[PDB]
Design a protein around this nucleic acid. Structure first.
Length: 211
DNA sequence: AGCACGCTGTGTATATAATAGCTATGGAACGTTCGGTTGTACATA
C-alpha cells in the first residue's frame, strides 16, 4: 500500500517480519514490523537481535501504530517507550477493550484527534451497506439434552456443532454463491472450522498456517 | 623296339608398310566390410 499510493522507492523499505529481517542501510528509510517482533523481551534470535538494535539506536521521526486498541496490553505498551520518536499516531476502526486499559492510551500516544461516523460514510459511497442479520437455529432435541448436563467449557463445542447450523450455513452459502458473491465464514473455534471446511470441500485458514 | 643319325620346322636378329584387336596405365567414382516441540503473549471466562 505504501509503495502503490506514494512515491516511496522500494530500496528504502524494509519489512521486519519472521520471514525476512534485512534492514535498509540508506540514510533515511522505512520499517514496517509487528508488535510480536518488537515487543519481545526475553528470547531474541541472533538474526533478530541486530535488527532490534538497529531500530533502537536510531531516533525515529514517526511511528504508525495500526490497530492501536492492542497497544495498552501488558507488554505491547513497552514498545511505545523503547522506540524513540517525536510523533506517534494511532489507527484503529474500534477503540474498545474489555478491560479498563483503554484510557491508558492518553499518556501513551496522546489524545483522540478525530472520529468519523459509520452511516455518514456509508451513504456517501465510501463504505458498503450491510444488512446485518441474526439467524435463530433452534437446537435439535437430541443435542439440546446434553447441553443441560455438560459443563461450561464443553457446552461451547456442543452448541457450535448442532446440525441445524450446518444446514443453515450450507443453504446460505449455496444461495449467495449463485448470486455471484464472495463469502467468508469466520469461526474462532478451530475444530468446527476444519469440520465445516472438510465437509464442504473449501479452503480454510487458522493460526498454524505458514504465511 | 631302342639308339644313332639325317631332315625339317621353330625361335632369335634386322629393316619396312599396312590393320584391327586387345592390353597396360593413370584418373574417377561407388558399394561392401572391418575397427516438531517450547515458551511467552494475548484475549476472554
Amino acid at each position: 500500500q505504501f509503495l502503490q499510493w506514494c512515491t516511496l522507492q522500494p530500496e528504502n523499505c524494509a519489512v521486519f517480519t519472521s520471514d525476512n529481517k534485512e534492514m535498509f542501510q540508506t540514510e533515511s528509510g522505512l520499517v514496517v514490523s509487528t508488535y510480536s517482533m518488537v515487543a519481545n523481551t526475553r528470547n531474541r534470535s541472533h538474526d533478530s537481535q541486530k535488527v532490534m538494535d538497529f531500530l533502537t539506536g536510531r531516533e525515529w521521526g514517526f511511528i504508525i501504530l495500526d490497530e492501536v486498541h492492542v497497544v495498552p496490553a501488558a507488554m505491547f505498551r513497552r514498545v511505545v517507550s523503547t522506540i524513540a520518536a517525536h510523533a506517534k499516531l494511532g489507527l484503529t476502526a474500534t477503540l474498545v477493550r474489555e478491560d479498563d486499559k483503554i484510557g491508558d492510551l492518553n499518556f501513551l500516544i496522546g489524545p483522540k484527534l478525530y472520529e468519523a461516523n459509520w452511516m455518514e460514510l456509508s451513504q456517501k459511497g465510501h463504505i458498503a451497506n450491510v444488512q446485518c442479520a441474526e439467524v435463530w437455529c433452534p437446537m435439535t432435541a437430541e443435542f439440546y439434552q446434553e447441553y443441560l448436563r455438560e459443563t461450561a467449557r464443553k457446552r461451547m463445542l456442543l452448541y457450535i456443532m448442532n446440525p441445524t447450523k450446518f444446514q443453515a450455513c450450507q443453504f446460505l452459502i449455496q444461495y449467495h454463491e449463485r448470486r455471484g458473491d464472495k463469502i467468508i465464514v469466520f469461526s474462532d473455534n478451530v475444530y468446527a472450522l476444519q469440520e465445516y471446511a472438510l465437509k464442504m470441500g473449501k479452503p480454510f485458514i487458522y493460526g498454524s498456517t505458514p504465511q
